[PDB]
Structures are given as structure tokens and as C-alpha cells.
Amino acid sequence: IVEGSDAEIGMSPWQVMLFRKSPQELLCGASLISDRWVLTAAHCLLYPPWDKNFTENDLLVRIGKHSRTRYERNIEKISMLEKIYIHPRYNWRENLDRDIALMKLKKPVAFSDYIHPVCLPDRETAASLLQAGYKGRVTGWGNLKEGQPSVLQVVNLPIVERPVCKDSTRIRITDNMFCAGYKPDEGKRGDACEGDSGGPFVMKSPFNNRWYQMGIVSWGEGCDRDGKYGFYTHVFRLKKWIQKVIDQFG
């Protein structure tokens, strides 16, 4: 996260760390949607161009974390994956279209002051909130500059209109994506950065006061460059697939 600030304890109880057993190292962010399901970006598990291709055995899921490197004895819970599910139509070849994957935990985690799932938007919630100018919040342990924080970082960023998004890049933008960030204008900065991948973009409903995850950190070009924006997987657009997965697989 670029130009963010340290999160408060218990601020994003759904923040998950995707952790590599060997070498032991942060892979990506992710989020808890229930006691047995974690949501992340598919490009965090499979990215052929870079020879990335994780399996269940390869990874560890760390929940209730604050410190990046410390093992938070009695706070954090570490779990095992039972199964990874990647979008059948994830497009890693061209523009990370449909960049989403579910991870099924070996056992259900227990909720605590520091552990708690985020809500998934409903068609209605998506409609009123996914609007240019509305701010969302991104969190993560990723790079501070295009180096690594000692604690979880946070930043609030506005959603940008589809045309500004498209016109900021040469990569083809699809309906499964949205971009967020300030304009060179707005004279406020911030972005996600390398290592933030798979983290949640969330918004707080003004109607029921609940936190909803609307996007997943997907991709960008550099971090916090003027005239460039962060791109997120549009979660309500892939809601159907997620449903399908959860009730067909537990």
C-alpha cells in the first residue's frame, strides 16, 4: 500500500495473509467470507508467465494478523487448505479478466476480536455503492513504494468512471473489473502495490452499517503513478460463480 497508514487493531478482521511454507514468505492478501472460505485473486495461485502454480500443499493461510513478520502467538490462527477453486474462465494470457479464486479451509476457524468475515454484496448493495466518487478501503502488507510495512497498511480511494479507467491504459478493460484512485488533480494519493494482490477493496453500507467486499486487488502499472489507477476484480459480477462453488462443494 502506497501512501496509506497503519491499520488499527481489529480494523479489518477479515484480512488474511497467503503464506508460503518454503521459503516462508508473504504471497498475497485474501479475505475471510465465512469460517471455512477465503477469497483471493486467481493470479496469486496461477500465473504461468512467471511460472507460478500453487497447490493446496504449497500454501498456508494466516488469519487475525496485524504484524507482517511476527508470529502473533495467541492472536493469529494459521490453517490448511483443503481445496483451491479458480475461475474456469480466469484470463491470465491477456488481462487478468475474472481474477478470483476460493480457498476451502481444512477446518473452520473460530471468530474472535481479530477474526471475522466480511459480507459479499447483493445486487442491490452493488448498485447503490459501486459509483464513481464513492470511496472504498484497500488493506495489505504489500510494498510501500513501487519497502514492506511492519504492520497492516490501509488506504481509502475513490471509484473512477469506466472511461477514465480505460483511457489510462493500453490493456483492454472488461465488465469484471473496476479501477480506483485519485486523479493527478485531486491532490491526494494512494494505491495498492506488489504484495497487496488478493486483498479486499471493501465499502461500509450506509443502510445497514455492514462492511461489504466489492473488489479484490488485481493489477496496476507501477504503484501510485499519476494518471494511472489500480484495478480490482469486480466481485458482485462473479457472485454467481462463488455461490455455485460454495454450495456444490460445502
Binding site: 480494523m11 476480536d113 471475522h116 466518487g133 472504498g136 478501503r137 490501509v154 461500509k204 455492514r210
Partner: peptide
């Protein structure tokens, strides 16, 4: 979920984090 998105240390105690106002004030306050 059911209990989703209500944070044991903020919502549940009715305490606000230090920048949530910023979000809410943008959904045009």
C-alpha cells in the same frame, strides 16, 4: 454470512475507526 461485516471492536461496541467517516461522507455523506 449473518454476522458478517460487523467488527467485534468497532461496530459491535459502536466505536468508529479513525477514517471510516471519509468513506461515509463520500456516499455523499
Amino acid at each position: 454470512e449473518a454476522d458478517c461485516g460487523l467488527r467485534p471492536l468497532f461496530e459491535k461496541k459502536s466505536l468508529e475507526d479513525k477514517t471510516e467517516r471519509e468513506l461515509l461522507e463520500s456516499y455523499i455523506d
